[PDB]
């Protein structure tokens, strides 16, 4: 597991690799874009709350906000969706996409320090 | 996925055609979106040339025409009483063209009492509220007191209409196609057409 933590006011990202379980036990079974308390990550994470903005799974497939599935799902994506940009007008491709609920089957957790 | 081609049929002699192409796009047909009674909901379609079709799914008002008085007002559609294609379309309350509907007579009653100064559809007890006393018993000028009584001679109504005005519900017949224009217009049934469809509804039960 890695965290791509980004602070929007100072505009600096950081990739922080975490290999534990107790540091990520607060993050499980949560959806995308919910404000959790990133406190159990370490000693310097006291007053920080952090929202889960996205993520990839172990095979590289990104997460999407609508799908409430614990695993991967095929979806037919058009223009204006995520995880897909068309090459032709009206071209709609079916791609596979990981759901929005956080698991241990992820590689990156995009995190936004909101406070 | 409907196709309204002519080549999926048999010939006049009865022989069946082996087809010479697959289904082309200009042969298409779309599903019947049957217009029901409810608060308005239209969904626009994109048809050939980029034009618009207003596929209405629920309709509640529509302007109708009292033909013999030259009066077009926007009423409220109540019911479906008889449909001369299929009668399962009456129990489903589907508005199609040429289906006989019940409308609300109140905009025509307000026009009649304003134009002829006669009480229409009132009961015999005649409880007349003062807000329409001023249009039924107004103060008239010198040239207007003869104009209203000049209108008052030919202000007769066929008695089949006044029984509908008693209960407040006129019979009307839709003359526009609601699944293609999104409106439910039409006309009020008068005279021989009225006493045809009346006995059709009466013999229906």
């Amino acid at each position: 597991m890695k965290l791509n933590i980004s602070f929007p006011a100072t505009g600096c990202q950081k990739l922080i690799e975490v290999d534990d379980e107790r540091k990520l036990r607060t993050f499980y079974e949560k959806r995308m874009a919910t404000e959790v308390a990133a406190d159990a990550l370490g000693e310097e994470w006291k007053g920080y709350v952090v929202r889960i903005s996205g993520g990839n799974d172990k095979q590289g497939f990104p997460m999407k906000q609508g799908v409430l599935t614990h695993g991967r799902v095929r979806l037919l994506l058009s223009k204006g969706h995520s995880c897909y940009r068309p090459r032709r007008t009206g071209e709609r491709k079916r791609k596979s996409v990981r759901g929005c609920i956080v698991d241990a089957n992820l590689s990156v957790l995009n995190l936004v320090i909101v406070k | 996925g409907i196709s309204r081609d002519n080549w999926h049929k048999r010939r006049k002699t009865g022989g069946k055609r082996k087809p010479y192409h697959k289904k082309r796009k200009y042969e298409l047909g779309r599903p019947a979106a049957n217009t029901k009674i409810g608060p308005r909901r239209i969904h626009t379609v994109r048809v050939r040339g980029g034009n618009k079709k207003y596929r209405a799914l629920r309709l509640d008002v529509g302007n109708f025409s009292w033909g013999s008085e030259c009066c077009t007002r926007k009423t409220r559609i109540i019911d479906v009483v008889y449909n001369a294609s299929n009668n399962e379309l009456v129990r489903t309350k589907t508005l199609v063209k040429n289906c006989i509907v019940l409308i609300d007579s109140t905009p025509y009653r307000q026009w009649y009492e304003s134009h002829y100064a006669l009480p229409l559809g009132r009961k015999k007890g005649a409880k007349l509220t003062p807000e329409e006393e001023e249009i039924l018993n107004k103060k008239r000028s010198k040239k207007i007191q003869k104009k209203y009584d000049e209108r008052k001679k030919n202000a007769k109504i066929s008695s089949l209409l006044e029984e509908q005005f008693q209960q407040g519900k006129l019979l009307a017949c839709i003359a526009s196609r609601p699944g293609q224009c999104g409106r439910a217009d039409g006309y009020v049934l008068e005279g021989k057409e009225l006493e045809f469809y009346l006995r059709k509804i009466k013999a229906r039960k």
């Binding site: - | 006049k12 030919n154 045809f196």
Partner: protein, 151 residues
């Protein structure tokens, strides 16, 4: 009532038949004005088209069809439908090798208006081209002359 045999109301759609009248109109006469029109190629509108009570939306004298294209002819063979008959056209096809002809025939289903009443089979009839009226019908009967074995 001699018209309204259907389940909807048969009505000539251009004519308004609910005009308000006065006491000399209700006591005088119940007059239905009728819609007729002139087909423009020298076919006389029959007096039955101007005096009838029939209602037909594909009649070429009272309904909504316009006659345009080929004007043809044929003789009547089968009158067994509602408002439409079967005429057969007879022609000779030239075969080039033998320098001879051969008898040939083709049928047409064709719409017969109710103004042409008392039509027997076996008489010549002029037909006129219009839009498709049904799956097989594209001509409309224009004038009926009687077979020479009449009187």
């Amino acid at each position: 009532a001699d018209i309204q045999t259907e389940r909807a109301y048969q009505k000539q759609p251009t004519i308004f038949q609910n005009k308000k009248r006065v006491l000399l109109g209700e006591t005088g006469k119940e007059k239905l004005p009728r819609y007729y029109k002139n087909i423009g190629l020298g076919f006389k509108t029959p007096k039955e088209a101007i005096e009838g009570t029939y209602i037909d939306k594909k009649c070429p004298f009272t309904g909504n069809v316009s006659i345009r294209g080929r004007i043809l002819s044929g003789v009547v063979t089968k009158m067994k439908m509602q408002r439409t008959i079967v005429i057969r056209r007879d022609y000779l096809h030239y075969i080039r090798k033998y320098n001879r002809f051969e008898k040939r025939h083709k049928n047409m289903s064709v719409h017969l208006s109710p103004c042409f009443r008392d039509v027997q089979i076996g008489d010549i009839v002029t037909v006129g081209e219009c839009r498709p009226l049904s799956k097989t019908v594209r001509f409309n009967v224009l004038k009926v002359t009687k077979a020479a074995g009449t009187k």
